[PDB]
Design a protein around this motif. Structure first.
Motif, mmCIF file in Angstrom:
data_model
loop_
_atom_site.group_PDB
_atom_site.id
_atom_site.type_symbol
_atom_site.label_atom_id
_atom_site.label_comp_id
_atom_site.label_asym_id
_atom_site.label_seq_id
_atom_site.Cartn_x
_atom_site.Cartn_y
_atom_site.Cartn_z
ATOM 1 N N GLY A 142 0.725 -1.262 0.000
ATOM 2 C CA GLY A 142 0.000 0.000 0.000
ATOM 3 C C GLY A 142 0.755 1.314 0.000
ATOM 4 N N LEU A 143 2.063 1.274 -0.236
ATOM 5 C CA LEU A 143 2.870 2.499 -0.258
ATOM 6 C C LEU A 143 2.339 3.445 -1.358
ATOM 7 N N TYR A 144 2.166 4.721 -0.995
ATOM 8 C CA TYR A 144 1.700 5.834 -1.853
ATOM 9 C C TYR A 144 0.214 5.847 -2.167
ATOM 10 N N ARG A 145 -0.498 4.801 -1.766
ATOM 11 C CA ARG A 145 -1.925 4.699 -2.059
ATOM 12 C C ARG A 145 -2.833 5.418 -1.072
ATOM 13 N N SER A 146 -2.336 5.659 0.132
ATOM 14 C CA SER A 146 -3.112 6.349 1.153
ATOM 15 C C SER A 146 -2.214 7.337 1.885
ATOM 16 N N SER A 147 -2.827 8.329 2.516
ATOM 17 C CA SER A 147 -2.085 9.356 3.245
ATOM 18 C C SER A 147 -1.224 8.858 4.409
ATOM 19 N N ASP A 148 -1.464 7.634 4.878
ATOM 20 C CA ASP A 148 -0.693 7.085 5.994
ATOM 21 C C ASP A 148 0.524 6.260 5.592
ATOM 22 N N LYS A 149 0.715 6.054 4.297
ATOM 23 C CA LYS A 149 1.863 5.293 3.851
ATOM 24 C C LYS A 149 2.513 6.128 2.771
ATOM 25 N N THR A 150 3.268 7.128 3.208
ATOM 26 C CA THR A 150 3.938 8.045 2.301
ATOM 27 C C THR A 150 5.405 8.317 2.645
ATOM 28 N N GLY A 151 5.973 7.569 3.583
ATOM 29 C CA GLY A 151 7.359 7.804 3.924
ATOM 30 C C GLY A 151 8.031 6.583 4.490
ATOM 31 N N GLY A 152 9.312 6.707 4.830
ATOM 32 C CA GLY A 152 10.059 5.592 5.377
ATOM 33 C C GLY A 152 11.376 5.518 4.640
ATOM 34 N N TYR A 153 11.969 4.330 4.530
ATOM 35 C CA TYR A 153 13.242 4.159 3.818
ATOM 36 C C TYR A 153 13.531 2.679 3.595
ATOM 37 N N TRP A 154 14.556 2.402 2.788
ATOM 38 C CA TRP A 154 15.048 1.034 2.626
ATOM 39 C C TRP A 154 16.525 1.181 2.892
ATOM 40 N N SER A 166 17.801 4.651 1.029
ATOM 41 C CA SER A 166 17.041 5.548 0.172
ATOM 42 C C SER A 166 15.789 6.018 0.913
ATOM 43 N N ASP A 167 15.404 7.267 0.669
ATOM 44 C CA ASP A 167 14.240 7.882 1.292
ATOM 45 C C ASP A 167 12.987 7.636 0.441
ATOM 46 N N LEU A 168 11.985 6.987 1.031
ATOM 47 C CA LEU A 168 10.742 6.670 0.331
ATOM 48 C C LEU A 168 9.848 7.857 -0.050
ATOM 49 N N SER A 169 10.023 9.009 0.587
ATOM 50 C CA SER A 169 9.175 10.143 0.245
ATOM 51 C C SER A 169 9.655 10.912 -0.973
ATOM 52 N N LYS A 170 10.758 10.462 -1.564
ATOM 53 C CA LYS A 170 11.320 11.115 -2.734
ATOM 54 C C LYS A 170 11.670 10.055 -3.750
ATOM 55 N N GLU A 190 16.416 -3.877 4.626
ATOM 56 C CA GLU A 190 15.329 -3.497 5.522
ATOM 57 C C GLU A 190 14.564 -2.371 4.874
ATOM 58 N N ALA A 191 13.251 -2.361 5.055
ATOM 59 C CA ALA A 191 12.411 -1.299 4.516
ATOM 60 C C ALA A 191 11.380 -0.944 5.584
ATOM 61 N N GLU A 192 11.134 0.344 5.786
ATOM 62 C CA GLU A 192 10.153 0.775 6.768
ATOM 63 C C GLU A 192 9.238 1.833 6.202
ATOM 64 N N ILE A 193 7.939 1.695 6.448
ATOM 65 C CA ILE A 193 6.953 2.661 5.978
ATOM 66 C C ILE A 193 6.338 3.390 7.180
ATOM 67 N N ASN A 194 6.127 4.697 7.038
ATOM 68 C CA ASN A 194 5.558 5.532 8.098
ATOM 69 C C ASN A 194 4.440 6.447 7.578
#
Length: 194
Positions: A142-154, A166-170, A190-194
């Motif tokens: 669900g990354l980028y599909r909803s307002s609650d999963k728009t950031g994090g990193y790998w 790498s930064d997931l918000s960019k 490792e990957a984390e979504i926030n």
């Protein structure tokens, strides 16, 4: 509601990638290569980083695991051209395809993997690793599909301690991309979504 930048990331990462094997180098210039694929199409690939500048010569064989930047064209002289970015490596294969050590956490809780492929190549560009990882995240997590999963990193950790992150918000930073790595030397991802 997500912001427009998040909307661009979803369209880029949800689409697929282009894969070609044993292509031949037609030309190598500063920031770009002209390559002829086995099915007869030509690929024009750009390389925006001073740290990842392919040094293959005309006639050498390469593999392509890349992303297209715009629609392909049919030329007057009957050719079919692809416009792509990065993702050119040598043709070395692994004795046996391996599965990469990916662990995902969504908001603290572990999220199981689904349809995460095996890899038989010895080398992969960091941008290829970036889209494979993020594609698993948009499609299965669900990354980028909803307002609650728009950031994090790998984060990738090598057997020697070297790491890549790498930064997931960019979108991936192609302009600073480092050289392809031997995937058999990766200790963890490792990957984390926030």
């Amino acid at each position: 509601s997500t912001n427009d930048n998040i909307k661009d990331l979803l369209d880029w990462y949800s689409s697929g990638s282009d894969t070609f094997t044993n292509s031949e180098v037609l030309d190598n210039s500063l920031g770009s290569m002209r390559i002829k694929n086995t099915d007869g199409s030509i690929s024009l690939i750009i390389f925006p980083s001073p740290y990842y500048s392919p040094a293959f010569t005309k006639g050498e064989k390469v593999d392509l695991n890349t992303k297209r930047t715009k629609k392909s064209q049919h030329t007057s002289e009957g050719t079919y051209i692809h416009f792509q970015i990065s993702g050119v490596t040598n043709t070395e294969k692994l004795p046996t395809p391996i599965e990469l050590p990916l662990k995902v956490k969504v908001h603290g809780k572990d999220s199981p993997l689904k349809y995460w492929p095996k890899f038989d190549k010895k080398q992969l560009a960091i941008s290829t690793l970036d889209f494979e990882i993020r594609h698993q995240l948009t499609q299965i997590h669900g990354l980028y599909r909803s307002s609650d999963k728009t950031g994090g990193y790998w984060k990738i950790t090598m057997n020697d301690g070297s790491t890549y992150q790498s930064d997931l918000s960019k979108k991936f930073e192609y302009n600073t991309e480092k050289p392809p790595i031997n995937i058999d030397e990766i200790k963890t991802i490792e990957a984390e979504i926030n």
